[PDB]
Amino acid sequence: ITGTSTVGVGRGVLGDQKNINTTYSTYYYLQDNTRGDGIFTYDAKYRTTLPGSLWADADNQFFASYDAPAVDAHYYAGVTYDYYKNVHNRLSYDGNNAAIRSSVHYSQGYNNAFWNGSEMVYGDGDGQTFIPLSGGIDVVAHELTHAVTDYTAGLIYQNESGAINEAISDIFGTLVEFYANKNPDWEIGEDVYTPGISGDSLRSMSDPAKYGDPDHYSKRYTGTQDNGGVHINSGIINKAAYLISQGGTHYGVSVVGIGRDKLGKIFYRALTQYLTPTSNFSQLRAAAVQSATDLYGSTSQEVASVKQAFDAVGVK
């Protein structure tokens, strides 16, 4: 829509108030013109046809409970865009400021969110397992990161390459959460997962086993479920990333942490420069080591920690 850029105010899924960039033209639309070619948020109206209708609002005030998921989807997509631009110098997911689109209120009682190859989609959850998914910043960054991966490495969504695809989304989803500095942690989706239970999450990077996910190559899932365990075996890579950043001793292997900042730089480089559509865990290890070598030298503590971390999760 062609209109006048302005700023509206609303309340997100968790009841927090925030300002959002909108566009005015008779109605106030959830169209952010301040970032690349724009961030557009649509209403799927409980249906499955996409994208739906660009979110129109009469007074630029988004305090209705129905508005909540839209406020967060729109706002968190903005934060994720900022993360990539300011930290990795990447303009949007394609690197050329492509418009970012998201639809909320997708279907009925849909307990998931996803990037469908062209846009992000968020279910409202069934109120038991999940509440509107866009309410989790790590969930939004996780999905948008799929767009980044699909435009760069292009990891196919199956077996080890798909687990890597999933881990990268969890890794950057987490880094974005730390970036926005909003109750950051190394868990996934804890802000929108099971409202009736405190302290749990969908997945854990610091301790994947906490929910039955493998934290070592020897425990990798080899079946065909979940496209060969893309959300399962991602735990092995998530654990490695956590160790690289925070350090620790895993299975008798000690790793000196180097921090989130360097973790992000190393993985972003591996993702955009060395990973390919069919890269496996072993190749990720090589990509990560080479990336750290490029950035800090082959005899650096950084290259050393990447090696220990992958040895710790049994990835050779």
Ligand SMILES: N[C@@H](CCCC[NH3+])C(=O)O
């Ligand atoms: N996003 C993951 C976990 C979702 C859990 C149930 N929504 C998947 O689609 O498998």
Ligand SMILES: [Ca+2]
């Ligand atoms: Ca309104």
Ligand SMILES: [Ca+2]
């Ligand atoms: Ca958190």
Ligand SMILES: [Ca+2]
């Ligand atoms: Ca989190």
Ligand SMILES: [Ca+2]
């Ligand atoms: Ca919970």
Ligand SMILES: [Zn+2]
């Ligand atoms: Zn994913």
